[PDB]
Write a protein that holds these residues in place. Structure first.
Motif, mmCIF file in Angstrom:
data_model
loop_
_atom_site.group_PDB
_atom_site.id
_atom_site.type_symbol
_atom_site.label_atom_id
_atom_site.label_comp_id
_atom_site.label_asym_id
_atom_site.label_seq_id
_atom_site.Cartn_x
_atom_site.Cartn_y
_atom_site.Cartn_z
ATOM 1 N N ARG A 1 0.809 -1.226 0.000
ATOM 2 C CA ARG A 1 0.000 0.000 0.000
ATOM 3 C C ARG A 1 0.833 1.262 0.000
ATOM 4 N N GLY B 1 -4.208 -5.986 5.547
ATOM 5 C CA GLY B 1 -3.460 -5.820 6.778
ATOM 6 C C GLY B 1 -4.105 -5.012 7.882
ATOM 7 N N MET B 2 -5.402 -4.723 7.782
ATOM 8 C CA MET B 2 -6.111 -4.062 8.896
ATOM 9 C C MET B 2 -6.077 -4.894 10.172
HETATM 10 CL CL CL Z 1 -4.722 -0.617 8.310
#
Ligand code: CL
Ligand code: R6N
Ligand code: CL
Ligand code: CL
Ligand code: CL
Length: 270
Positions: A115, A205-206
């Motif tokens: 990201r 990836g939260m």
């Molecule tokens: Cl995140």
């Protein structure tokens, strides 16, 4: 015999401290350290490795457990290359675990980096699902030999140089409703953790359960709330992960069933 086998495995798991040199610290914590190393192999050449550093009972427990782990042999389960036991200058035992060096690191960090502009490119749907199938395959192998993982999460899955994911490192928000309650823990508890891990992957990836605090978790699940569907996650992928969190463990699918469900879904994508 059962004793026979355990003696063999013990024999096979230990590495001569001579065959190992330790390098820089890659990581450090209350757990211990991860260091780079070189391992001299039977073929005369050295291999880059990762070295994780951590009562005689506790040592024998470590050795026995290490012996079992070295015996796992599946592309989606991390290969334990062996162990060394060194001793500190205070006479405290310093057990070392030798593992492959994996340049792409843990799956969680990799998702986060995708990201960022300098990290890996955007990871498409197909590849995120592939990662889930790999983890399911590794977990299918382990549960079929009655081994419980107990800490399954994206941070404990590793990416190999060919982008294969393997489960490794055998956390309230990953813990199933009944192991919060009874401290009781089956492979269906691992299935629960796998669904959470699938959600970590699909959100790139939260942290699970945004808005909900660790002390609130048991009561949140007790009133029937589960992880929310991620944006742009297929309905059918969500169904699969949601099946992992069914209140009653016996209603959850096995890893075998999950794995085939995930392979079918993946098959169906363009
Ligand atoms: Cl995140
Ligand atoms: C089961 C634990 C050990 C499994 N093996 C393993 N191998 C390697 C690593 C690295 C690591 C690898 C390479 C670099 C430098 N370059 C980065 C860029 N790349 C293209 C070339 C290399 C720096 C760190 C971090 N970890 C950590 C992950 C998270 C774990 O919790 C604790 C180890 C590693 N673990
Ligand atoms: Cl050394
Ligand atoms: Cl491996
Ligand atoms: Cl949520």
């Amino acid at each position: 015999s059962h004793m026979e086998e355990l003696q063999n495995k013990l024999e096979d798991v230990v590495i001569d401290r001579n065959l190992l040199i330790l390098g820089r610290i890659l990581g450090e914590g209350e757990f211990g350290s991860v260091m780079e190393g070189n391992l001299k192999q039977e073929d005369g050449t050295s291999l880059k490795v990762a070295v994780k550093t951590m009562s005689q009972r506790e040592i024998e427990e470590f050795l026995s457990e290490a012996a079992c782990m070295k015996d796992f042999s599946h592309p989606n389960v991390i290969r334990l290359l062996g162990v060394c036991i060194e001793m500190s200058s205070q006479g405290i035992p310093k057990p070392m675990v030798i593992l492959p060096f994996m340049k792409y690191g843990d799956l969680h960090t990799y998702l986060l980096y995708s990201r960022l502009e300098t990290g890996p490119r955007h990871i498409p749907l197909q590849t995120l699902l592939r990662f889930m199938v790999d983890i399911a395959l590794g977990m299918e192998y382990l549960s079929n030999r009655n081994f419980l993982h107990r800490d399954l999460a994206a941070r404990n899955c590793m990416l190999r140089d060919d982008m294969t994911v393997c489960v490794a490192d055998f956390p309230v928000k990953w813990i199933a409703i009944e192991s919060l309650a009874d401290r009781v823990y089956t492979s269906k508890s691992d299935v629960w953790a796998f669904g959470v891990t699938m959600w970590e992957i699909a959100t790139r990836g939260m942290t699970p359960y945004p808005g909900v605090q660790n002390h609130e978790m048991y009561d949140y699940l007790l009133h029937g709330h589960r992880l929310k569907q991620p944006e742009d996650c297929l309905d059918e992928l969500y169904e699969i992960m949601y099946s992992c969190w069914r209140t009653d463990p016996l209603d959850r699918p096995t890893f075998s069933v999950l794995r085939l469900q995930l392979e079918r879904l993946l098959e169906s994508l363009p």
